Amino acid sequence: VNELERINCIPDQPPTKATCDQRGCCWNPQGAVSVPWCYYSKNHSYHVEGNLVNTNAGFTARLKNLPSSPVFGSNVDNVLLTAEYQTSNRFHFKLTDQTNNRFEVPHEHVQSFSGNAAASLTYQVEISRQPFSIKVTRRSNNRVLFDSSIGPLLFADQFLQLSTRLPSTNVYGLGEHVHQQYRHDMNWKTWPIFNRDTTPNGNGTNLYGAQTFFLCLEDASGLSFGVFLMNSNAMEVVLQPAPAITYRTIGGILDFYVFLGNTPEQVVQEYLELIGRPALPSYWALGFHLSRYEYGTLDNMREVVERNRAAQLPYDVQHADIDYMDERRDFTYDSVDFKGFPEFVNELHNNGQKLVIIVDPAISNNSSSSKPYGPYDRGSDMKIWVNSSDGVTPLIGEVWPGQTVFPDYTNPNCAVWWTKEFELFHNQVEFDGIWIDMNEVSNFVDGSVSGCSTNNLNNPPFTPRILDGYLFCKTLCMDAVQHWGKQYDIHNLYGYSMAVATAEAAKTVFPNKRSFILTRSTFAGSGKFAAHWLGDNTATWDDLRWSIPGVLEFNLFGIPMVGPDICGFALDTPEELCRRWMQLGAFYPFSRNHNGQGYKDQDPASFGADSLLLNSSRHYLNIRYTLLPYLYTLFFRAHSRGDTVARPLLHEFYEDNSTWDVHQQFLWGPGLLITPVLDEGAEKVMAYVPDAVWYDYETGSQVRWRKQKVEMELPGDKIGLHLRGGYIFPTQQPNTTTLASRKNPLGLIIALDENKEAKGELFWDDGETKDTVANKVYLLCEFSVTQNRLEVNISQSTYKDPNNLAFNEIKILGTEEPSNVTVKHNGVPSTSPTVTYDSNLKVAIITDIDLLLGEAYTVEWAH
Ligand SMILES: *[C@@H]1O[C@H](CO)[C@@H](O[C@@H]2O[C@H](CO)[C@@H](O)[C@H](O)[C@H]2NC(C)=O)[C@H](O)[C@H]1NC(C)=O
Ligand SMILES: O=S(=O)([O-])O[C@@H]([C@H](O)[C@@H](O)[C@@H](O)CO)[C@H](O)C[S@+]1C[C@@H](O)[C@H](O)[C@H]1CO
Ligand SMILES: *[C@@H]1O[C@H](CO)[C@@H](O)[C@H](O)[C@H]1NC(C)=O
């Protein structure tokens, strides 16, 4: 037994031969660091009893427990395996207790499979019976993708474990954590997953959300696969250099999906087809957002808003944190410090901006006839609180307002209550979107104001290595009771259920609009409802660097609108760090500068009306806004097809092994390469330039670099931005708000490849109506350039923007001088446009043209 393949039999304590012998495992203390001294033997677990049975969907097998001493308690004697060949690219298998119903995640999107095994499978499944293992191989090359035979199946009531070999070390995903790098360290690493309010720092703890998905790039051909575990109990995932991964959970069932794709993008698409593709955001949510904890007063907030508006900062959204509230209570505002809040909301709206308000789940229980607190009275009337273990008394904890009860968003009636609270509050403050926070759920006491009873839920036989080592730390008692079940089973689902309930509330408060929901805690599928931010980071260079893997991983998870707090939540931010973070932050799919309580101001204009930081911030935000039609179309593809938005280099450049661990650069979609300076004092960045033609975004000059590491010169006012040859990028003249920018002239940037060809697309709808994609009210056009000729081709034409939008500029990169430029409309000539040519840079710009959005054109030229 090769030491890299040993599966640890003593995860719970310092390894001893005595414990090893008792557990019937193998003892060998002579390995390298982290190699398990005690590891499972060749036959520990389950065997198949009798024959497999064909079903319409796949097959079932009965697994029988081989005799073994009970380590983490009540072992499951008869296990049922149910396997379903759900699609050509997705396999589903579950291990359940044959004679008892167990908790299964009540997911809102995923449904039970009815139907027949798919035809033309890209995979094969192989079951070994003595001892049990399950293998999933790729049919084309027989590559073993999933293979549980490396370790036992373990299945006790509060301890379930299965391992899989992996075909490579290119492993990406799992969450929510700060991994620091994007490609996984496979060198004996354990990642705990249990929704927790904790600082995203260098300690590798469980954080706000629970994401069990990972993607593996098998080799340079691009062939990739993914694995998702549908389980919401506390768990940890163990990575080792075999390479192999082990999932270790403390309840529910092992419900696994395996996805195959021809590229990393296709694996993500397969995962999202299962779990739910992300919502198409409101176009305004793609703009820049500004926020802080404790402006203190509306006057102070209003002063910040005004100096950034005075600076002409692209600036769509203002967030109001708990300081707007009357003593930190939801659905109120402070009538003294925030007197005139409704007038301020009108000011934002008149300026073409949006208000996003924070709402916390926990509700103050302080109410009397003397001073009623409406949300609590109404919630108690409807009996929609999380209860203590007696099943009848609302659990009391403590959050921002003091003592609180917690809504049980798993109860359908709770969404009715929540909806009414928002309707009532929206009648006072006409906010545009909702930021749901502290929804792990976060509790300032451990469990409840009276602690937690000692029992198998609060104190289980095995505890994954979660921060502080107790499940109820800074959250609710594990024996608290909700509609879907006990907190032990549904804790990781709280913020998911809250986001589902908040989207329901939006149906009434914002009829037929998308609005915007931003959530802290997530589960698999949360992106269908909400954006995410990476939580309470710190103003350090480490946090700046660590942000990029976090953004890429949430894109894998189908929450593409993701970003950190730009400049750093905790601590005063250094000018240089904030300047670099604003440059990079202009390109986070969710772009928000947010700051903690009491720290020095870090809004862009606070650095000086004429400062390098403000100038550069404005410059790069103006570039972001210019590329919004491109970014929005990327979101359209995430929503409709399941593509990533912020995308790892390796998803486009998988043939090139130098991209497999790149985490200091990323792409927008296939075509825009972003190269930030991430090191203090630096005016350079060591960067990778992939195997494509690349053009400097601002000058349009073709770089000489290709497929190579470079030292990119990036002075204090620059971030690297390069356009990929072969792509056509739709643009729109920027303005300080997207309300205004969407009325502006459009442009095309044609970045020619080595063959002088390029292709692109543009999605365009009204930017805010819900279901425009499902109801087919949108424009989708395709651009292609193949020598001497641009074609604009319309594939869907069921929305026509009333603002007379047209492409009034075409910039062609990598071209010899165009002559005789001719424009045809539906094949019919043809006015001569203006052409400007830079012969040193090989850039042509065509102007004095008006190609109406939604019409077919051909633009032809000679050389
Ligand atoms: C939490 O406890 C409350 C009682 O405090 C339960 O309320 C019941 O709710 C239903 C309406 O759905 C009513 O038919 C019952 O009359 C209520 N019971 C009482 C005693 O008033 C509530 O069901 C509990 N929640 C959970 C998840 O168990
Ligand atoms: O006092 S804090 O440190 O700021 O509290 C944070 C943690 O709960 C934890 O660090 C401490 O409670 C334990 O020391 C909490 O997450 C802040 S919330 C999310 C943020 O984005 C909003 O601006 C804040 C107000 O709504
Ligand atoms: C930009 O927006 C302002 C409103 O903030 C508007 O007055 C102005 O005309 C817009 N500029 C255009 C049309 O580019």
PDB file of N, CA and C and ligand atoms in Angstrom, residues 309 351 733-737 740-741 743-745, ligand 3:
ATOM      1  N   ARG A 309     -20.130  61.424  -6.597  1.00  0.00           N
ATOM      2  CA  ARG A 309     -20.874  61.986  -7.735  1.00  0.00           C
ATOM      3  C   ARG A 309     -20.181  63.236  -8.309  1.00  0.00           C
ATOM      4  N   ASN A 351     -30.950  60.777  -9.553  1.00  0.00           N
ATOM      5  CA  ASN A 351     -29.573  60.772 -10.082  1.00  0.00           C
ATOM      6  C   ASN A 351     -29.249  59.504 -10.885  1.00  0.00           C
ATOM      7  N   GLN A 733     -20.700  53.620 -25.003  1.00  0.00           N
ATOM      8  CA  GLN A 733     -20.123  54.780 -24.370  1.00  0.00           C
ATOM      9  C   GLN A 733     -20.580  54.835 -22.908  1.00  0.00           C
ATOM     10  N   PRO A 734     -19.622  54.964 -21.991  1.00  0.00           N
ATOM     11  CA  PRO A 734     -19.939  54.911 -20.559  1.00  0.00           C
ATOM     12  C   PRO A 734     -20.591  56.220 -20.069  1.00  0.00           C
ATOM     13  N   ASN A 735     -21.303  56.112 -18.957  1.00  0.00           N
ATOM     14  CA  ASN A 735     -21.823  57.281 -18.275  1.00  0.00           C
ATOM     15  C   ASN A 735     -21.737  56.877 -16.804  1.00  0.00           C
ATOM     16  N   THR A 736     -22.049  57.808 -15.919  1.00  0.00           N
ATOM     17  CA  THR A 736     -21.843  57.580 -14.491  1.00  0.00           C
ATOM     18  C   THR A 736     -22.856  56.600 -13.899  1.00  0.00           C
ATOM     19  N   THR A 737     -23.929  56.324 -14.630  1.00  0.00           N
ATOM     20  CA  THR A 737     -24.929  55.316 -14.226  1.00  0.00           C
ATOM     21  C   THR A 737     -25.301  54.452 -15.423  1.00  0.00           C
ATOM     22  N   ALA A 740     -28.330  55.781 -17.590  1.00  0.00           N
ATOM     23  CA  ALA A 740     -27.903  56.671 -18.663  1.00  0.00           C
ATOM     24  C   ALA A 740     -27.067  55.982 -19.728  1.00  0.00           C
ATOM     25  N   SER A 741     -26.135  55.117 -19.332  1.00  0.00           N
ATOM     26  CA  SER A 741     -25.184  54.527 -20.312  1.00  0.00           C
ATOM     27  C   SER A 741     -25.901  53.662 -21.345  1.00  0.00           C
ATOM     28  N   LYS A 743     -28.494  54.216 -22.869  1.00  0.00           N
ATOM     29  CA  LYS A 743     -29.049  55.066 -23.955  1.00  0.00           C
ATOM     30  C   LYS A 743     -27.948  55.535 -24.907  1.00  0.00           C
ATOM     31  N   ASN A 744     -26.704  55.179 -24.633  1.00  0.00           N
ATOM     32  CA  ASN A 744     -25.576  55.725 -25.430  1.00  0.00           C
ATOM     33  C   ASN A 744     -25.247  54.909 -26.718  1.00  0.00           C
ATOM     34  N   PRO A 745     -24.533  55.531 -27.666  1.00  0.00           N
ATOM     35  CA  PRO A 745     -24.067  54.831 -28.873  1.00  0.00           C
ATOM     36  C   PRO A 745     -23.230  53.595 -28.510  1.00  0.00           C
TER      37      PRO A 745
HETATM   38  C1  LIG B   3     -25.142  60.890 -18.923  1.00  0.00           C
HETATM   39  O1  LIG B   3     -26.080  60.992 -17.866  1.00  0.00           O
HETATM   40  C2  LIG B   3     -26.617  62.270 -17.539  1.00  0.00           C
HETATM   41  C3  LIG B   3     -27.520  62.125 -16.309  1.00  0.00           C
HETATM   42  O2  LIG B   3     -26.715  61.780 -15.195  1.00  0.00           O
HETATM   43  C4  LIG B   3     -27.372  62.824 -18.753  1.00  0.00           C
HETATM   44  O3  LIG B   3     -27.829  64.133 -18.505  1.00  0.00           O
HETATM   45  C5  LIG B   3     -26.422  62.836 -19.933  1.00  0.00           C
HETATM   46  O4  LIG B   3     -27.062  63.316 -21.115  1.00  0.00           O
HETATM   47  C6  LIG B   3     -25.858  61.420 -20.161  1.00  0.00           C
HETATM   48  N1  LIG B   3     -24.921  61.505 -21.251  1.00  0.00           N
HETATM   49  C7  LIG B   3     -25.050  60.894 -22.423  1.00  0.00           C
HETATM   50  C8  LIG B   3     -26.362  60.988 -23.169  1.00  0.00           C
HETATM   51  O5  LIG B   3     -24.095  60.277 -22.885  1.00  0.00           O
END
